[PDB]
Amino acid sequence: HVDKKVADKVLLLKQLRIMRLLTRL
């Protein structure tokens, strides 16, 4: 009961900055 595209809009979309946060470059 969850929209697939919404996952992209939060998981993948924010991942762009999340990767920066994880690597801590």
CB neighbourhood size of 15 (10 A): 13
* Polymer length in residues for the chain: 25
Helix (H) and strand (E) counts in the chain: 2, 0
Q: How far is 17 from 21, CA to CA, in rounded Å? A: 6
Which method resolved this structure?
NMR
